Design an enzyme around this catalytic site. Sequence first.
Site, PDB file in Angstrom:
ATOM      1  N   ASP D  63      52.856 -73.485  77.011  1.00  0.00           N
ATOM      2  CA  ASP D  63      53.355 -72.955  75.738  1.00  0.00           C
ATOM      3  C   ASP D  63      54.644 -73.636  75.283  1.00  0.00           C
ATOM      4  O   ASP D  63      54.875 -73.786  74.081  1.00  0.00           O
ATOM      5  CB  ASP D  63      53.544 -71.436  75.799  1.00  0.00           C
ATOM      6  CG  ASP D  63      52.388 -70.676  75.168  1.00  0.00           C
ATOM      7  OD1 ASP D  63      51.919 -71.087  74.084  1.00  0.00           O
ATOM      8  OD2 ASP D  63      51.958 -69.656  75.747  1.00  0.00           O
ATOM      9  N   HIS D  97      55.700 -67.051  72.510  1.00  0.00           N
ATOM     10  CA  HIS D  97      54.763 -66.894  73.626  1.00  0.00           C
ATOM     11  C   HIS D  97      55.421 -67.263  74.954  1.00  0.00           C
ATOM     12  O   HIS D  97      55.314 -66.521  75.929  1.00  0.00           O
ATOM     13  CB  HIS D  97      53.492 -67.734  73.426  1.00  0.00           C
ATOM     14  CG  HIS D  97      52.697 -67.368  72.210  1.00  0.00           C
ATOM     15  ND1 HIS D  97      51.790 -68.231  71.630  1.00  0.00           N
ATOM     16  CD2 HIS D  97      52.678 -66.243  71.456  1.00  0.00           C
ATOM     17  CE1 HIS D  97      51.242 -67.649  70.578  1.00  0.00           C
ATOM     18  NE2 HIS D  97      51.765 -66.443  70.449  1.00  0.00           N
ATOM     19  N   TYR D 101      56.871 -64.573  78.503  1.00  0.00           N
ATOM     20  CA  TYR D 101      56.594 -64.674  79.937  1.00  0.00           C
ATOM     21  C   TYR D 101      57.850 -64.398  80.762  1.00  0.00           C
ATOM     22  O   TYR D 101      57.778 -63.758  81.812  1.00  0.00           O
ATOM     23  CB  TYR D 101      55.991 -66.038  80.299  1.00  0.00           C
ATOM     24  CG  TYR D 101      54.743 -66.402  79.518  1.00  0.00           C
ATOM     25  CD1 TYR D 101      53.656 -65.525  79.445  1.00  0.00           C
ATOM     26  CD2 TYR D 101      54.642 -67.627  78.863  1.00  0.00           C
ATOM     27  CE1 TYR D 101      52.509 -65.858  78.730  1.00  0.00           C
ATOM     28  CE2 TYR D 101      53.499 -67.971  78.144  1.00  0.00           C
ATOM     29  CZ  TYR D 101      52.438 -67.081  78.082  1.00  0.00           C
ATOM     30  OH  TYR D 101      51.305 -67.415  77.374  1.00  0.00           O
ATOM     31  N   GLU D 188      46.393 -67.090  69.101  1.00  0.00           N
ATOM     32  CA  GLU D 188      45.704 -68.317  69.506  1.00  0.00           C
ATOM     33  C   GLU D 188      44.301 -68.479  68.922  1.00  0.00           C
ATOM     34  O   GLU D 188      43.841 -69.605  68.716  1.00  0.00           O
ATOM     35  CB  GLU D 188      45.673 -68.454  71.033  1.00  0.00           C
ATOM     36  CG  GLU D 188      47.040 -68.719  71.670  1.00  0.00           C
ATOM     37  CD  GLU D 188      47.799 -69.874  71.023  1.00  0.00           C
ATOM     38  OE1 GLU D 188      47.162 -70.778  70.436  1.00  0.00           O
ATOM     39  OE2 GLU D 188      49.045 -69.884  71.102  1.00  0.00           O
ATOM     40  N   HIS D 191      45.142 -69.849  65.553  1.00  0.00           N
ATOM     41  CA  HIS D 191      45.638 -71.204  65.806  1.00  0.00           C
ATOM     42  C   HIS D 191      44.485 -72.197  65.969  1.00  0.00           C
ATOM     43  O   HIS D 191      44.436 -73.217  65.279  1.00  0.00           O
ATOM     44  CB  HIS D 191      46.518 -71.224  67.062  1.00  0.00           C
ATOM     45  CG  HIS D 191      47.882 -70.635  66.869  1.00  0.00           C
ATOM     46  ND1 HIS D 191      48.910 -70.841  67.764  1.00  0.00           N
ATOM     47  CD2 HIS D 191      48.393 -69.858  65.883  1.00  0.00           C
ATOM     48  CE1 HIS D 191      49.991 -70.208  67.346  1.00  0.00           C
ATOM     49  NE2 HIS D 191      49.704 -69.605  66.206  1.00  0.00           N
TER      50      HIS D 191
END
Lengths: 129, 129, 284, 284
Positions: D63, D97, D101, D188, D191
């Site tokens: 990412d 994104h 994490y 995504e 995307h």
Amino acid sequence: QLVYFSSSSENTQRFIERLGLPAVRIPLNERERIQVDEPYILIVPSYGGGGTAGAVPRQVIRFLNDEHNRALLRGVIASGNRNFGEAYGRAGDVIARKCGVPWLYRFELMGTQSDIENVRKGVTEFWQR
Amino acid sequence: QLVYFSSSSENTQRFIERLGLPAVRIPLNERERIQVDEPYILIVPSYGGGGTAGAVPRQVIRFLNDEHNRALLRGVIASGNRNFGEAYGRAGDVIARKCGVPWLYRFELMGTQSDIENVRKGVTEFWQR
Amino acid sequence: RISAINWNKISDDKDLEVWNRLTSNFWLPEKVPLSNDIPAWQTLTVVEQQLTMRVFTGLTLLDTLQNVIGAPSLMPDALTPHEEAVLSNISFMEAVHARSYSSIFSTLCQTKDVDAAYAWSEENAPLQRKAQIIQQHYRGDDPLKKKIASVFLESFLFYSGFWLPMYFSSRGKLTNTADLIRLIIRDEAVHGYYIGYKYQKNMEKISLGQREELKSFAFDLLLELYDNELQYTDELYAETPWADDVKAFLCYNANKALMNLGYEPLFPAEMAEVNPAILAALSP
Amino acid sequence: RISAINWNKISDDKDLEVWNRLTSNFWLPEKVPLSNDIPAWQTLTVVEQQLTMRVFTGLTLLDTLQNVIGAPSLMPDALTPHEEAVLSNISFMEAVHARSYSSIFSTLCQTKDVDAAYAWSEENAPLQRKAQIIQQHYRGDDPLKKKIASVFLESFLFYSGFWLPMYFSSRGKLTNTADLIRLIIRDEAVHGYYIGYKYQKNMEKISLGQREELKSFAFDLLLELYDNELQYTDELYAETPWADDVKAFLCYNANKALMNLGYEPLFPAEMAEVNPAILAALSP
Ligand SMILES: Cc1cc2nc3c(=O)[nH]c(=O)nc-3n(C[C@H](O)[C@H](O)[C@H](O)COP(=O)(O)O)c2cc1C
Ligand SMILES: Cc1cc2nc3c(=O)[nH]c(=O)nc-3n(C[C@H](O)[C@H](O)[C@H](O)COP(=O)(O)O)c2cc1C
Ligand SMILES: [Mn+2]
Ligand SMILES: [Mn+2]
Ligand SMILES: [Mn+2]
Ligand SMILES: [Mn+2]
């Protein structure tokens, strides 16, 4: 006298440097000792995030949590930027309402020559009354 | 007989071509209106959020608003993407709920070979009712 | 080559501070009820309407410049990987700013007059020179000059256009459009602070003599852009008696742009005396 | 060089459709109550915890790659000014994104365990080989190959990692983390749709000979990344009995990645038959 806080960007620091008046800085480091013996006016920048606005920096809170420091507080000047709207100098009135001190002046960034002139004249007249 | 809509990306268009069954397309141009005579199953992609906040494309709404076309609707198949969670194929059960027709099948993008074979078998068995 | 970003391994605390401030201040023009300004748009004169459209078509060009070239040109010069991520937010929000001007046109204005304002902006000499000067520094080889240009554009130059919605706000006109503009202003206040802060941090790893050259360049660039913006103000506000009030608002913001870069204000109080109604529109 | 963007003069309707979908779906990791997953995290075995951290450190790298190099490399090849603005959003959301994490790590995990997982990712051959192949095409001079690589990464490859939060979700564990991952997945899907759509629009302007050349390249690249991903799955899921279901989930998403680019699915039903509980976690 004067007590102030300035982040690593040092807008308030440069304001004090150009002011000329003797002042002590609230340390940028979180875990450092800070105590004052003579009565003072506080100069604080504003750092309001979003929802639960923490406009007053952590170091200023830790400084005011001391009962000896809080007792010598007599007035507060706020630093910031007009572009934040109603939140301009938000740190000023938050401390003013919590500690019961008057909110004296508001200026932007490192302060213009007009801001330096108004503080010099405002501070000296404040202590004499 | 099948009626379908497909955007300029033509995922649904490619599904119909691989299906091998005769089908009439609802015009991509919003100004154009079309009428069918035979009973049909409708194949629609979902477009909830971004477009009209609703799942059903504007051209399909105009197609069904015609009382002639709506009365010949017998079933609906929804296209979309499983990655959209609860909104996956939501255009299907909206038309199924509003028009009182059974929601027959849901598939993704241009459809897998399993999807094609299931729709082939599904449609042929459907028209014995 | 590329390393995984770690937001629990912060080098400069300001990166996270500005990330949180900018991302939590996220907004879209659709969130502003612009339709409530239609009754107010009617009361405006043809001159005021024409001025409004010419202002926003100009601001659309410069925000597009910030999105496409402006913010991305600063990315190779980022000190931290977290600065790269913050600049990604800045670039995106520039596209939101430019988009929001089209939302104002779509809600309030007629297509014919808007297209005429777009054509007026394309042929306008001061606006094009401003775009060229700023863009040439973005394509240059000096990382620090790019930061100066970016701060000067959106902490100073933009306010020749920002003046108008602030003035209307004080007259009780187009209040929702002013609210939308204040959201842009709130973004640019942080943008100028951050880019200016990173400018000063990069000034720490250059010689004392090189700092003096760049200080001289900054005031040279400011006065070159200032002289150009005076012409731009004259041509925009020609059919109004507001020219002098905008120019004082420019000098006031020019000083703020200098303070973002850590420099002394250039313009004296008498040149920067803004109408109190404009300042009250900024801070209610 | 620069033209003022006009969102009322749209060339391709999909640009506005995707802009509205991506911006209205704005989210931050702070909006998800990740701290509520602490009880569920502490019921996991050391094997499960270690696997979770290694999965997310791998996704962080990829990412970050998408933010820094991925989306920016698509900007010079844009067909419309509106496509450039949408890519600015995509790039920023890639940074969101990657940031999310770290939000998981900070909330649930121990610092020394997170650092160990980062070191494991750095020394993992299949993960680094995957990162090199994708960046190779990004820094190449074939714009259409950049779109292929971008779709293959986040509509296909990412799902070897995305399987785990969906599995925990099906057993009623780490539900808030699963909700966060579904927000990433929701981004995504659009995307890959958009980049895949633009790939097909660009191929309409080239000869049939080059289309077949790119088709052959796409399938050859897919199999190359797939074979490498099988090795990545084996090494990642070594201490578990889940490898076979992860691989089936990978083939399922590979077919979706191909379809985004306008190609027929390649993986048969028996290879792509995902456990229905994983599919139910994806679409409740
Ligand atoms: C995250 C952030 C939040 C801020 N919030 C406010 C605010 O709410 N009101 C205001 O007047 N200024 C606000 N400011 C501007 C600062 O108060 C201003 O730049 C100040 O001069 C900084 O002083 P310093 O460099 O000494 O710390 C904010 C700045 C940042 C970076
Ligand atoms: C703006 C937008 C919104 C979408 N919304 C949904 C949705 O709510 N549910 C769903 O299952 N798919 C959704 N999709 C995915 C499409 O339905 C899917 O890609 C479909 O195959 C498109 O078919 P077409 O290319 O023939 O128009 C959306 C796609 C876009 C671009
Ligand atoms: Mn801007
Ligand atoms: Mn900006
Ligand atoms: Mn991503
Ligand atoms: Mn992506």
